[PDB]
Structures are given as C-alpha cells and as structure tokens.
C-alpha cells in the first residue's frame, strides 16, 4: 500500500488504523517484532534457539519495510516512535553476522531511513564482505546464503531465497547510490528473471522487480537502437529485429528446429533482454534433489469407496532444524 499510494490515495485512515495494529500489539520491549498468527513465511538456518533469535530479527527488519513505506501516509508520532524503538533493535542485534537473508533484509530496511547510522554502515561493509562475484573486473555479482562457510559457487541453480537477498542488498545499494557497485549485480538478475516475473516464490519476485525498476529511473536512460538478430547454430537463419522505442517488447517467438541458438547483435546500443525459457518431460525424479519425505497411495473403506492418502515430512539441510518447514503446497496431480 504505502507503494500503491502514489498512484492511487489509500484510505488513510485504514493504513492509520493498520499501522496502529502492528505497532500497539506486536513489538516487545526490546523493539523486535512477533509473529500472532501460525504462519511461517520462511524458515532459516539455525539452531532450535538461533532459529528463532534469526526469525525475530526477520519479522522486525521485515515489518519496519512494510511500515517504512506507508509511514508517510501516517506519521503519527505514536509510529514513529516505533520505528526507532525496533531499528535499535536491527541495529544492536544483527551485527554479529547470523547469516547472509539475515544480514541483507535487515540491510534494506534500516537502509530505508538513516543511511548515517555507524551501525548500519559496519552492517553493510559487513554486507559487501559477503559480496559474491565473477569474470574480473567483476562481470557477475550476488549473494546466497553463506553464513559460515562460503563456496563461492554459481550453480545453474539459483535458489529464490538467492535471489531475494541479492535484491535486498541490490534495494540497500540503491538507496545508498552506489551505481556503480550495483551492476554486476542486476546484469545477474535480469539474466535470471523468466520471462514474465521473476520466477521463484513470489518474495523474490517483488523485490527484485522493485530493484530493477527503481534502478531503470535511476540511471541515465539509454536510447534503443540495437539489431537484434537470432540464428540457430547450424540450421540457418531465424527471426530478427530492429530494436526502438516502438519496437521493443516484440513477439516470443516459437524456436522449432532441434539446434543450438545464437542470438547477436549489431553495432547500435541500448540494452536488450534475451531470455528462452525450455520446457520437456522427464520420466523420472531418480535424479532430482529430494527434499521431502513422500509416500503415497491408494485404498479402500466402508459400502466401498476409494481413497487416496498422501504424506509428507520434511528433509531438513544441514544448518536447518527439526523444527520442520515453512508455508508449503501438496500438489496431487489425479490419474485421468
């Protein structure tokens, strides 16, 4: 909402009322923030004690961006207050670096006010010391969830939760400015980005939308003049196009012919997305990365009707605990 809101006014009164609903109830005495409901968004490395003390530190930072965006709409001092009480919190608690979705969150949502802080400026060189990058001068640049260890590795993989810190570091950097630190880091997401959103989870998803956005009115906006032609290997020629201010965003073209692809480009400039998203089918999950205990099947009962039983537990990694997973989906795709 505090979002929407420059675009279309918001009750105000509601994102009052609202506001006023998270502050009055749910912040305890050292300014944290804590969870009513059930619900677990996420789940974090941690131990049965260090996991929680993680998540605390999750929910605040977390918050004091939702209200840290709808703030303007109701500076009421009684929030305001409340803001301070629970960034003292962020800032006397993170630092002694838990994990890398801890240290980046945290970043971008103290980073929302009061860029000056000492504190907040040692949590994000403490930030950038996580820094992981590649090709030199540094082509490639995110972050993953290293705590610890850090294999700096890039594996074709890229987890949602990869993308989401990343993006909460991309969002701190540019409410710092710091332009120049930041595009290793978008050429590393917009490389990542399926066509369409953002691809994993829906968190992610957002804040790295809100980066690439808020960067594309940021820096100097460049003019599309780029030839964009696409081949495949061996095969020959397919589709090509100019590439302007009135041709962009051009049709998702079909690649029919079992061949490599070869996209380049001319001389011109601008700056140009090519993503190919491929699709088939697998027999079989033998290969795949269990993470989840399954079992199934199917029975009988009185009268007779057949039912299906279907069950789960959880693969917990190895920094994760036997707290058992977050919000999660079962999908049970019936026999035709």
């Not at 007779?304 to 079962?330: F, L, N, T």
């Amino acid at each position: 909402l505090g979002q929407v809101n420059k675009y279309v006014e918001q009750n105000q009164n509601s994102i009052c009322n609202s506001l006023l609903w998270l502050v009055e109830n749910y912040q305890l005495d050292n300014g944290s923030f804590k969870e009513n409901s059930q619900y677990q968004p996420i789940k974090l490395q941690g131990t049965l004690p260090v996991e929680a003390r993680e998540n605390s530190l999750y929910l605040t930072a977390f918050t004091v961006i939702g209200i840290r965006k709808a703030f303007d709409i109701c500076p009421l001092v009684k929030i305001d207050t409340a803001l301070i009480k629970a960034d003292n919190f962020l800032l006397e608690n993170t630092l002694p670096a838990q994990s890398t979705f801890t240290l980046a969150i945290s970043a971008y949502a103290l980073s929302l006010g009061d860029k000056t802080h000492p504190q907040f400026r040692s949590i994000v060189s403490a930030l950038k010391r996580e820094a992981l990058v590649k090709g030199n001068p540094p082509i490639y640049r995110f972050w993953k969830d290293n705590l610890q260890h850090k294999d700096s590795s890039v594996p074709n993989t890229g987890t949602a939760r990869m993308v989401e810190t990343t993006a909460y570091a991309l969002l701190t950097s540019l409410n710092l400015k710091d332009i120049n630190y930041v595009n290793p880091v978008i050429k590393w997401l917009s490389e990542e980005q399926r066509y369409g959103g953002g691809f994993y989870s829906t968190q992610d998803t957002i804040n790295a939308i809100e980066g690439l956005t808020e960067y594309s009115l940021l820096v100097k906006q460049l003019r599309l003049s780029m030839d964009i032609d696409v081949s495949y290997k061996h095969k020959g020629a397919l589709h090509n196009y100019k590439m302007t201010d009135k041709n962009f965003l051009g049709r998702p073209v079909e690649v029919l012919l079992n061949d490599d692809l070869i996209v380049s480009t001319g001389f011109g400039s601008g700056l140009a997305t090519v993503h190919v998203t491929t699709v088939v089918h697998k027999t079989s999950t033998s290969e795949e990365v269990c993470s989840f205990y399954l079992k199934i099947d199917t029975q009988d009962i009185e009268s007779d009707y057949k039912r299906i039983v279907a069950c789960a537990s959880y693969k917990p990694s190895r920094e994760e605990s036997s707290s058992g997973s977050s919000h999660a989906v079962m999908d049970i795709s019936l026999p035709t």
